[PDB]
Structures are given as structure tokens and as C-alpha cells.
Amino acid sequence: GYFSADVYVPDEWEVAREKITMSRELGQGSFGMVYEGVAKGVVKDEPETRVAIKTVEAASMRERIEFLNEASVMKEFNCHHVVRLLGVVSQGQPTLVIMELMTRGDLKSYLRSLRPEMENNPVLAPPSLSKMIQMAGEIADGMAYLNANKFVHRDLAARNCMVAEDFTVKIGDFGMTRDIYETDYYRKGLLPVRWMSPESLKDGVFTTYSDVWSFGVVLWEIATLAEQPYQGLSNEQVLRFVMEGGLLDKPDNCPDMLFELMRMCWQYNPKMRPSFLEIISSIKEEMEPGFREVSFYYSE
Numbered sequence: 498g499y500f501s502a503d504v505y506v507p508d509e510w511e512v513a514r515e516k517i518t519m520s521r522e523l524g525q526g527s528f529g530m531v532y533e534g535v536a537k538g539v540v541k542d543e544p545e546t547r548v549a550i551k552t553v554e555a556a557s558m559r560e561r562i563e564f565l566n567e568a569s570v571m572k573e574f575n576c577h578h579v580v581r582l583l584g585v586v587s588q589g590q591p592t593l594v595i596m597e598l599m600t601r602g603d604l605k606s607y608l609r610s611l612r613p614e615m616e617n618n619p620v621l622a623p624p625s626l627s628k629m630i631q632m633a634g635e636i637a638d639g640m641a642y643l644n645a646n647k648f649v650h651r652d653l654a655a656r657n658c659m660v661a662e663d664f665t666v667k668i669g670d671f672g673m674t675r676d677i678y679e680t681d682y683y684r685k686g687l688l689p690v691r692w693m694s695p696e697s698l699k700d701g702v703f704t705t706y707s708d709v710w711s712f713g714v715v716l717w718e719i720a721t722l723a724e725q726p727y728q729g730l731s732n733e734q735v736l737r738f739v740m741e742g743g744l745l746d747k748p749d750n751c752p753d754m755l756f757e758l759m760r761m762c763w764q765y766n767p768k769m770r771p772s773f774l775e776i777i778s779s780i781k782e783e784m785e786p787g788f789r790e791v792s793f794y795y796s797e
């Protein structure tokens with residue numbers, strides 16, 4: 498005959514609704530509206546914590562179940578450089594998922610906000626080597642953690658990183674900016690072709706080594722303040738260019754070292770690319786002191 502129905506099963510992440518409050522709306526995701534707020538007793542030794550609250554009500558039960566199970570993916574991760582899931586409210590409506598708040602948003606958006614506006618007003622200078630490296634190492638650390646946890650990301654990109662209040666960069670909540678930056682995708686399956694390794698453009702397979710490639714592109718993103726890679730090239734022309742050993746250009750005024758890093762990631766042969774761990778090792782001396790205390794890299 499056959500094999501039989503999708504459910505959500507409450508667990509230890511279940512949090513009491515009356516412990517949650519919402520205020521400022523941050524935007525809207527696929528499943529519904531996303532708010533900022535306060536959660537009580539969801540971080541150890543913190544009476545109260547600022548959080549992000551993703552909501553589904555209107556919505557069908559199939560839908561909210563699927564939003565529940567998808568968000569839950571984040572439950573198996575505990576890393577300073579990966580955006581946390583703090584709780585779930587699945588009992589009653591509306592359906593809630595409580596996440597770590599990243600006040601400064603997705604990295605692509607943060608990066609763009611640093612672009613000088615077209616007025617006559619004084620402006621902060623472009624990010625320094627040092628700050629840029631700090632971001633690279635935080636991102637790399639989250640990726641290393643993910644890798645060691647048997648994960649392949651497949652969509653590593655600035656849009657898929659977030660930025661905390663203290664400027665700490667982290668691997669973003671999975672799948673939260675795809676639709677928003679829709680032009681960053683191409684239906685080769687909607688895929689982020691400008692971030693893709695040559696091997697992945699060929700056979701459609703993703704590895705940690707193709708996550709490194711994309712990391713290279715994320716660094717380029719930082720250096721250009723979130724320009725579209727292969728700017729002038731059509732989607733199709735990108736495939737050929739990249740598969741044929743083509744490479745992104747050293748950005749105007751990009752420090753040598755950051756470009757060197759990018760360069761090591763964009764090596765054609767995946768087996769010649771540094772691992773995430775190796776990447777961090779090459780730049781640890783440049784990292785803010787506190788990285789020893791918080792990073793996966795330096796941990797047991």
C-alpha cells in the first residue's frame with residue numbers, strides 16, 4: 498500500500514506567551530510579520546531579553562506547521578557567531594518564534610547604509626581593514642562551527658548574515674532574506690548564481706569548499722559595500738565567466754590582504770581552498786581580543 502502527515506511537536510523551547518511582548522515591526526517574512534520585543538526568562542541570568550519575534554493567523558494550519566518545523570532547524574545550534582533561536586510559542590495564536598535580536602539587520606543592508614549619500618553632509622570614512630577583518634573572522638567562525646556540525650550552508654552571502662547592536666556579525670537565521678533580495682537569485686531552482694562556485698554551477702552540488710568560495714564573495718561584498726557581483730554581466734554570462742575561470746576584480750581601494758583572502762577562496766580547484774578553520778588561523782592575530790572567549794575557533 499503506502500506510507501502515511503506533518504506535525505509540530507512541542508518541546509523544551511516552548512515558552513509561555515504571557516512572557517512575551519511585541520512592539521516595533523521589523524518587517525515581513527514569508528510566513529508573516531516580524532517584530533521586535535522583549536522576552537522574559539529565555540536567557541540565563543537575564544530577567545529580560547530584547548528579541549525578534551516572527552509571527553504567522555489568517556494562515557492555514559499546514560502553513561504554520563511548516564513555519565514551525567523550518568524555524569526549528571536553528572535549535573541545534575549554539576554559537577556566538579550564529580543567530581539564536583530563543584523560544585517558541587506554538588500553543589495558541591498567533592504562532593511565535595522568538596529569536597536573537599540583530600538590531601542593525603542583515604549585513605547586506607548594513608553595508609549599503611555605509612555608502613555615502615548624495616548630499617553635502619559629512620560622512621564616516623569607509624570601513625577600515627581592521628573592522629573588515631573582524632567581520633570576516635566572525636562570519637568564518639560561524640561557518641566553521643556549522644561545518645563541524647556537518648552542515649553545508651549553500652546560500653552564504655551578506656544578505657544571509659546579520660549584524661548585532663554591538664556590530665558583531667553572525668550567520669543569519671536560515672532563509673530570512675531570499676525573497677527580499679530576489680534579483681540576487683536566478684532560476685538556472687532559484688539559485689544565487691553570483692555567489693556560486695564553478696563546481697556548483699556545473700553539477701549542482703554544494704560542499705563546505707563551495708561555502709568558502711561564497712565567503713570569498715562575502716568579503717568582496719564588504720569591500721564594495723554590497724555591490725552586485727559581476728555587475729555588468731547577465732545571469733547567463735556569469736555562469737560562463739565563472740565556470741571558465743573568470744574572477745571578481747580587486748575593488749578600488751581594497752586593502753591587499755583582504756583581496757588576498759578573497760583570492761585564496763576563489764581558487765578554481767576546491768581542494769586548494771583554505772578551510773574555514775584555516776581561514777581564521779591566518780587572521781586570528783587581527784581579531785579583537787574577546788574573540789578568544791566567544792569564538793568556536795578558540796573553544797574546546
Ligand SMILES: Cc1nn(C2CCNCC2)cc1Nc1ncc(Cl)c(-c2cnc3ccccn23)n1
Nearest residue numbers: 523524525526531549596598599602603670673
Ligand atoms: C533583519 C533585520 N532587519 N532589521 C531592521 C533593520 C533596520 N531597517 C528595518 C529592518 C532588524 C533586523 N533584525 C532581525 N533580527 C533577527 C531576526 Cl530573526 C530578524 C528577522 C527575521 N525575519 C525577518 C524579516 C524581516 C525583518 C527582520 N527579520 N531580524
